[PDB]
């Protein structure tokens, strides 16, 4: 039980995720305590949304921790795809948070607020500070690439929401501003999250690695030129992690073809293309 | 463009999904039209939630349609894992809908309602009728198994929400009832959705097929008993669809071992275990 905390603190990314998760949960709890007295209609909703984004960050942290585990004869490739699952979950979280922001903006535009306003803006500035700190901490530029990108996009979406509420507060002092700003924030969040979901779905759909896809015809041509190789059939290349490709091949060779040399040459050819793990089945054709 | 509609109507499951999607979107639009006049705070939120569940059903329908497409040298295994992705997305949708129901129940329990009540209950009965019709239509007991289970669980969750609001309405006439009922509905939704997410994550994590896992040691023992097979190493079995298993194997055999016979016997052994697609790499050991 205590080994989890030591492991999380040992890793840099896990430690940063734990720091941000604790900070978000504590600030959500503080907002809940400040809003339990009154103004529940907005503060309770905001606190629950913060707790929900906290759940998304916790999911990313759990995937990051689990990604370092070893094989157990059940997960033959290991838990390495936890990062891809976390990226997909973060993308869905961002889409649904954008839709929630859309709904809240529409509700505010179609309802006059009689609740306290100064407290709402003050805690929103604190949330903006939290989001800016999160952006600063997670600035980047067992494999762990998708999780960092997902959490960074999540922090960007939270920052967009914070700047939206701040700009609405500023413009109201100096009615149309709030819905337009909410729609713009939601659209920006969706457009930003699109590439992450594209990559995660590409990985999760057993698609050919996009980087490897260009060089596959050349590799097939070079394998075909090997002596004794009649044909190449049933080729399947898919992605496991970032820069980790797994490919399966079936070769049909001459009845007396040099199986060892053909196998070694095929492995070299597909290793020069970046396929770390490869399985080649050599079939000896009949005549 | 028009080919999509003909294809959707051709398939039974796609036709049913399109029927339910159109019905849900039309009823959400009707509720929006009825609530545009007044009582926005609850009716607008309910209509947007219906449109959001409509988006989840549309995602399931799109996965069902795409699951029938052919290979294009990019998706080597095809788009067959769209059903698994749809199941995972439906599971996440159910979890987040349960959390939304939790939040709405807490808000209702911590805020006295001054809005119209008779209209809210009447449209809720209509939603319950819609959910019961959906349960009746999708009663069951390119592969398409996860999508049906996901949409069925979604309809079950919507039915649970409808019975919760109806029971709260009945009990209020005859304050504590609403939050307790909301919590119970959310817990039931999460517990119901747990197995679907378990199966979808197991498929998406490149885990060994749970049905095949029991018989793998026996198959390894029977392959080891083959003449000339020194050892069996680097075995990876994962799941592509329902009852579609893909396995990769590496054998180390004698310098003069019968490669053809060993390959045929290994393929027969793993085909009798249900592995439809298998790749065996035979390495000729040096001494």
């Amino acid at each position: 039980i205590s080994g989890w905390f030591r492991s999380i603190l040992s890793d840099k990314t896990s430690r940063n995720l734990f720091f941000f998760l604790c900070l978000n949960l504590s600030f959500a709890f503080v907002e809940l305590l400040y809003g339990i007295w009154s103004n529940c209609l907005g503060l309770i909703s905001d606190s629950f949304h913060m707790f929900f984004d906290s759940t998304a960050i916790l999911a990313g942290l759990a995937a990051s921790v689990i990604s370092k585990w070893r094989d157990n004869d059940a997960f033959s490739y290991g838990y390495v795809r936890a990062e891809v699952l976390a990226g997909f979950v973060n993308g869905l979280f961002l889409i649904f948070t954008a839709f929630f922001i859309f709904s809240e903006g529409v509700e505010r535009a179609l309802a006059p607020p009689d609740v306290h306003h100064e407290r709402l803006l003050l805690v929103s500035i604190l949330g903006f500070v939290v989001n800016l700190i999160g952006i600063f901490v997670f600035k980047h530029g067992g494999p762990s690439r998708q999780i960092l990108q997902g959490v960074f996009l999540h922090i960007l979406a939270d920052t967009l929401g914070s700047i939206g509420v701040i700009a609405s507060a500023i413009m109201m002092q100096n009615m149309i501003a709030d819905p337009i700003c909410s729609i713009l924030i939601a659209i920006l969040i969706v457009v930003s999250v699109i590439p992450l979901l594209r990559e995660s779905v590409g990985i999760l759909m057993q698609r050919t690695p996009p980087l490897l896809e260009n060089s596959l015809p050349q590799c097939y041509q070079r394998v075909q030129q090997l002596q004794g190789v009649y044909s190449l059939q049933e080729q399947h290349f898919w992605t496991l992690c970032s820069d980790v490709y797994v490919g399966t091949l079936k070769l049909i060779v001459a009845p007396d073809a040099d199986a060892r040399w053909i196998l070694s040459q095929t492995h070299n050819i597909f290793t020069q293309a970046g396929v770390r793990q490869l399985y080649v089945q050599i079939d000896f054709a009949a005549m | 463009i028009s080919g999509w509609f003909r294809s959707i109507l051709s398939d039974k499951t796609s036709r049913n999904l399109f029927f339910f999607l159109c019905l849900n979107l039309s009823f959400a639009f009707v509720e929006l039209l009825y609530g545009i006049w007044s009582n926005c705070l609850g009716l607008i939120s309910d209509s947007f939630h219906m449109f959001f569940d409509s988006t989840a059903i549309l995602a399931g329908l799109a996965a069902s349609v795409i699951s029938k497409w052919r290979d294009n040298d990019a998706f080597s295994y095809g788009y067959v894992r769209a059903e698994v992705l749809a199941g995972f997305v439906n599971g996440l949708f159910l979890i987040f809908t349960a959390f939304f129901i939790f939040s709405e129940g807490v808000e209702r329990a911590l805020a006295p309602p001054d809005v119209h009540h008779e209209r809210l209950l009447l449209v809720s009965i209509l939603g319950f009728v819609v959910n019961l019709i959906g349960i009746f239509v999708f009663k069951h007991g390119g592969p398409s198994r996860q999508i049906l289970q996901g949409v069925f669980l979604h309809i079950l969750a919507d039915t649970l929400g409808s019975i919760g609001v109806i029971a709260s309405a009945i009990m209020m006439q005859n304050m504590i009832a609403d939050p307790i009922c909301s919590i119970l509905i959310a817990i039931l939704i999460v517990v119901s959705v747990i197995p679907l997410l378990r199966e979808s994550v197991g498929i998406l994590m490149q885990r060994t097929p749970p049905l095949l896992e029991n018989s793998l040691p026996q198959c390894y023992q029977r392959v080891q008993q083959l003449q000339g097979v020194y050892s069996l190493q680097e075995q990876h079995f994962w799941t592509l669809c329902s009852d579609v298993y893909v396995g990769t194997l590496k054998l180390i055999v004698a310098p003069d071992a019968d490669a053809r016979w060993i390959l045929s016997q290994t393929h027969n052994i793993f085909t009798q275990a249900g592995v439809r697609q298998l790749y065996v790499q035979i390495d000729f050991a040096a001494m």
Partner: antibody
Amino acid sequence: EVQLQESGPGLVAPSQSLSITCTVSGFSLTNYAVHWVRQSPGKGLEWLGVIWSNGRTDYNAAFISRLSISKDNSKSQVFFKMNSLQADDTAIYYCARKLAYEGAMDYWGQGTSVTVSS
Amino acid sequence: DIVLTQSPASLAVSLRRRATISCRASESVDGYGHSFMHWYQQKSGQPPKLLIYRASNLESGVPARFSGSGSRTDFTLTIDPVEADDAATYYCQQSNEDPYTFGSGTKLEIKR
């Protein structure tokens, strides 16, 4: 009892083609590959080409524009044809079957000496 | 292309002493632990006879006195004990890279 017999012209003009027939016995061409190797005093043993069971041919990079290797499974004959013979192409042309599942040539035939002169 | 160099060019050994022929490749001819180097024996006016395939395996029917070793680039053919019938020319062939190449022969002279 495995023999490979070459039958070809000993003397070839310095501008004509060459044709050597390699008649095999004791094994079937349907499951063996026959290589073509020439040996000359000034250049040593050189690998020209090989023809496989299904008819696929692999040629040397420096002879790909001139070689032409055919088969006749029923007659158990392998035909070697080279164009644009020159004074440096005189050698002893051997046809040798490929060792099963290896890149070596276990059985060789006593090739026919070829000279290219006017 | 792979250039195979055999040293020495001419070797003189006694009737029963130890004989060693070395063939060095320009680049490695190894793959997955297999060295694709083959050794041939060509007597006077005869086609070459395969002795060693994959640099360590004796051809079926050859005398046991022939041995092979080496890996990557350096390879060694060992004849022990030598006999009067071993006076021939020995070539090394690599099948690792197209085209197949034969090294310059190593003439063996039996002293008496």
